[PDB]
Write a protein that binds this ligand. Structure first.
Ligand SMILES: NC(=O)C1=CN([C@@H]2O[C@H](COP(=O)(O)OP(=O)(O)OC[C@H]3O[C@@H](n4cnc5c(N)ncnc54)[C@H](OP(=O)(O)O)[C@@H]3O)[C@@H](O)[C@H]2O)C=CC1
Ligand SMILES: NC(=O)C1=CN([C@@H]2O[C@H](COP(=O)(O)OP(=O)(O)OC[C@H]3O[C@@H](n4cnc5c(N)ncnc54)[C@H](OP(=O)(O)O)[C@@H]3O)[C@@H](O)[C@H]2O)C=CC1
Ligand SMILES: CCc1nc(N)nc(N)c1OCCCOc1ccc(-c2ccc(C(=O)O)cc2)cc1
Ligand SMILES: CCc1nc(N)nc(N)c1OCCCOc1ccc(-c2ccc(C(=O)O)cc2)cc1
Ligand SMILES: O=c1ccn([C@H]2C[C@H](O)[C@@H](COP(=O)(O)O)O2)c(=O)[nH]1
Ligand SMILES: O=c1ccn([C@H]2C[C@H](O)[C@@H](COP(=O)(O)O)O2)c(=O)[nH]1
Lengths: 523, 520
């Protein structure tokens, strides 16, 4: 038996990023303190997390623990152990830590130096002796760095409850580099915002009549993917990070997808009908299991809003997303023989500002032709917010054959409650490997832009997938990415002075604290 | 009590019996005909039966033997008690029931396979044996006496949703004595739908981690005891629970928001339901629905018609209020004729982009006949991801009596099977959504049959999803009813083109429903 399993010795900590195309890894989050105190101002959500974890006890589990500890030697409360510097960093009004047995490591200080109800120990060996004497549920080590360092060395930590604070601060002490061979992550929380920073919470691990009725009801339960190839992914117990909506859908298509061929001849695994929900109040859902850029997708969004159908505008900003859909060859295969190269026809922008107008060419002045659906939906959100008709539709059935291609992004519906704006986007055809990471980004940004110019706060972006597919040529790359653990998402900042939907320029957009795995050629 | 000690359960299978009509649990009361099962063999029940009555977990046995012994003042398998008729009705290749300890109650039979002469001599035999649980397999006599003498802990009741000729019945089950704890998925086997219900007599390192991850989880003007029955179920796998869970969720967490009429709703945003059309026809059973009107509307759509009068003369009144002089004047359609709803569903599916004149004009070959198009795609290019049928014509909205609630259908074809997604921008959960599920379910079948495919899944995506405040008391009654197995839909198989269906070509079979609820 290990000492730490007998006595249930855990560590808990919160690490931020520290100062300097960078590389990220687990060691990115390592900043513990600065000049005796915490690097940040009080982040509330971490404090509530730390108290809940350090105060929680289950009495009906004590019995088996009392036995286990008895066996090894022959209201219930947890124990918390702090280094002396750590103890001094805590405000007086929080001392001793409430509903917990406070223990302090020190040489320079003795029991006579403290007014408070606390145990003083001068060595770690004496902590084990004390734990041996006391009635307690679990034992949490609270730092600081020197304390952490020596409890990791001595192999005394069964699990690390680790908060990733997704900001940079000035630091002077640091959590030890964890060894992947000693400890591996088994669990990852939802992402949250608190005090103007995103954060998440991860757990590192050291390396009943009605039950039968369940089995009964399951009496009636393909693709050559080796489960082993998802070792890390399948090892995780709690996959609550919202990036798992995407990754889990990939997994589901790999294991249960249907083999079909598409135009190209590649073939896909396909399924039909999924929903993802992302909370933009708490994070910007830019994937972290691989590197993604946003310059292009913002430039496309702005080109849409201006009503444009001219491919050259994008090419001249060196955005190439629509290049291949504009070649002589592509247009000719679409039978658009009388269409100039890079004239993509009555696509997104045109439908958003001019639905129902007769498309001529990409240079025409279509002012006051068609329905300016973008304007109308901005008006509805402002003046008729409970309308269930706030919908913006790119799929104009009449003009489909005159488009370079039909829209994948069929419609956005909007929802307003309590000064907050949510968005449903319905996607008829979803390339999971390449297209969807970008598409989540695009409509998440657009939710912010619409939200802001209508004086609402963004709430939820909801992505409804119809035909959802993984290309075969993407499978190996997705296998890799599925075995990566997401980092906390970044945030998106918009210039607040931009008060009309048409007045945004690329420099009005900032992505902050993007932490991500390495870039991936899906091919 | 004895049945707790010795874990004596019943397991049975009951069909409907040949005689408005009323339905309740008693409807499912038929066990046998002429010493044989009333049905020709139903496989899923056989596989359920077997798997229920052979399943054992050896890790749980200590407790059982412990209790048993304390009470008697003292390769694991189950016990299976049969009546004599029961035992003989079984063909020989199935006797003795493999892998189970076979007991026969008889007053005439003569003694591995035990014989018992009266009931009390089971409890003796149980006190002597090692076994997991004890299953009473019938027949009627056995059930009766085991039941009247409180010797049954749970009933595993297979509800066979079809009518057969029967001479012997299951006892009535007293809703004071027993109540349903669980209901399974619905399935199709041997040309019948069926479900399984359960009557009940009336590393924890990761366990802490779950609590921690819940440290932030915290409107309800509704009450617990309001949903006693709903909340006291353990397994709710009946697909009717897709609808009802959504209502529950709106009633619990919905946003208070007021609509144009000043009625008030609770609304939420973004739901999916999925119904397997291969196994059933999802016509809500926790209340009565009628289908003639909604089929006629579907036929009106396909003909491409915009004339409210066509429906009104067949007494379908779905669109009546949207066609009044008042309702169009308010829509600023002063130059539109009463019951001329303008360029709605029909017009958009058959003439999208045509200039709408009036409901009597001749539109042949005007606009895009997208229904023809999607049907051609299904037939000739089934892997296209462009098979959508869109009613949301941004150009025509203002000229419609009202914008479509059913924005679009997307189709998908794999291995000779068709699935359909319908996206609905606005979902009146109490009144509209039940009819809407039926409507797009039938259409899915209609499209599939005319393209030589089998229907697979209907998938229903709710946008703005809401419950009217005057519906709440009725949805309360409705949540505490327990679904029955769904019916099936039959289309006249002769019909091979989407435009050749008539009202007579649709038959609902075996619709077992609770009593109609007046939504107000
Ligand atoms: N972000 C987070 O999650 C946390 C941050 N912190 C931060 O960390 C910093 C404090 O960490 P750090 O500087 O490493 O100081 P520590 O809190 O690790 O304290 C070290 C001191 O504790 C005593 N001590 C440690 N180990 C032993 C031992 N084996 N036997 C006897 N006495 C021992 C000694 O006290 P003495 O000198 O009196 O002999 C020693 O100098 C602060 O900036 C604090 O805010 C702290 C905890 C958690
Ligand atoms: N769908 C379902 O769930 C099931 C249906 N069935 C069907 O049920 C029918 C059989 O039911 P049923 O006709 O009632 O016949 P049973 O199977 O109930 O047989 C009854 C006989 O069992 C013996 N017995 C019953 N009670 C006692 C007692 N207290 N003490 C001693 N012996 C007793 C007697 O045989 P004796 O003459 O020896 O005294 C009695 O006549 C068949 O049609 C069969 O196919 C069969 C299994 C379950
Ligand atoms: C950061 C907490 C934390 N979280 C995780 N996840 N793990 C840990 N080991 C951990 O530290 C625990 C030991 C230190 O405890 C402190 C420290 C500071 C305060 C404080 C309160 C108010 C102000 C203010 O408002 O000025 C400032 C500081 C309260 C408790
Ligand atoms: C119906 C099963 C069942 N289910 C539930 N849920 N509860 C029960 N109590 C229960 O039956 C109890 C005794 C089962 O006994 C059998 C076994 C086999 C056959 C049989 C008949 C015809 C063929 C054929 O024609 O091939 C094959 C097999 C008939 C009766
Ligand atoms: O904005 C877009 C455009 C295209 N695609 C992908 C999905 C398909 O793999 C392909 C287009 O499919 P169809 O046009 O055949 O549906 O491009 C996207 O994911 N997003
Ligand atoms: O087939 C139909 C027709 C109407 N509605 C309901 C949804 C809304 O309660 C209302 C439509 O009103 P607006 O959403 O257009 O305001 O009618 C349905 O659910 N199904």
């Amino acid at each position: 038996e290990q000492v730490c399993d007998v006595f249930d010795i855990y560590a808990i900590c919160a690490c931020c990023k520290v100062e300097s195309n960078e590389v990220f890894n687990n060691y990115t989050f390592r900043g513990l303190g600065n000049k005796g105190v915490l690097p940040w101002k009080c982040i509330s959500l971490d404090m509530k997390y730390f108290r809940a974890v350090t105060t929680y006890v289950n009495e009906s589990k004590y019995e088996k623990l009392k036995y286990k500890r008895c066996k090894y030697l022959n209201k219930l409360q947890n124990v918390v152990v702090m280094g002396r510097t750590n103890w001094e960093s805590i405000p007086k009004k929080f001392k001793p830590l409430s509903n917990r047995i406070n223990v302090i490591l020190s040489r320079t200080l003795k029991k006579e130096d403290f007014d408070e109800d606390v145990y003083i120990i001068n060595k770690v060996e004496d902590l084990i002796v004390l734990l041996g004497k006391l009635n307690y549920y679990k034992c949490f080590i609270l730092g600081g760095s020197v304390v952490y360092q020596e409890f990791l060395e001595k192999k005394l930590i069964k699990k690390i409850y680790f908060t990733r604070i997704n900001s940079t601060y000035e630091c002077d002490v640091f959590f030890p580099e964890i060894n992947e061979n000693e400890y591996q992550i088994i669990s990852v929380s939802d992402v949250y915002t608190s005090n103007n920073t995103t954060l998440d919470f991860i757990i590192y691990k050291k390396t009943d009549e009605e039950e039968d009725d369940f089995v009964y009801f399951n009496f009636n339960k393909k693709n050559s993917i080796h489960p082993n190839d998802f070792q890390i992914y399948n090892s995780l117990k709690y996959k609550y990070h919202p990036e798992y909506q995407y990754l889990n859908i990939i997994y589901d298509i790999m294991m249960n997808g249907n083999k079909q061929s598409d135009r190209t001849g590649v073939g896909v695994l396909s399924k039909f009908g999924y929903i993802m929900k992302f909370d933009l109040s708490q994070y910007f859902p830019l994937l972290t299991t691989k590197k993604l850029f946003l310059r292009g997708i913002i430039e496309e969004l702005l080109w849409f809003i201006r009503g444009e159908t001219n491919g050259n505008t994008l090419l001249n900003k060196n955005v190439r997303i629509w290049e291949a859909n504009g070649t002589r060859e592509f247009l000719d295969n679409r039978k658009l023989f009388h269409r100039e190269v890079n004239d993509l026809g009555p696509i997104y922008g045109f439908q958003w500002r001019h639905f129902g107008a007769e498309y001529t060419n990409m240079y025409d002045n279509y002012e006051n032709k068609g329905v300016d659906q973008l304007k109308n939906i901005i008006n509805l959100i402002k003046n008729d917010p409970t309308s269930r008709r706030i919908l913006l539709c790119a799929w104009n059935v009449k003009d489909l054959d005159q488009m370079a291609l039909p829209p994948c992004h069929i419609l956005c519906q909007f929802y307003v409650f309590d000064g907050k704006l949510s968005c449903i986007m319905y996607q008829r055809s979803c390339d999971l490997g390449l297209g969807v990471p970008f598409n989540i980004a695009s409509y998440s940004i657009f939710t912010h832009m619409i939200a802001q110019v209508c004086n609402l706060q963004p709430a939820q972006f909801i992505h409804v997938l119809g035909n959802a597919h993984v290309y075969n040529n993407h499978i190996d790359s997705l296998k890799i990415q599925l075995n990566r653990i997401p980092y906390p998402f970044p945030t998106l900042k918009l210039n607040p002075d931009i008060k009309n939907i048409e007045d945004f320029t690329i420099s009005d957009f900032t992505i902050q604290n993007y932490v991500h795995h390495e870039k991936i050629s899906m091919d």
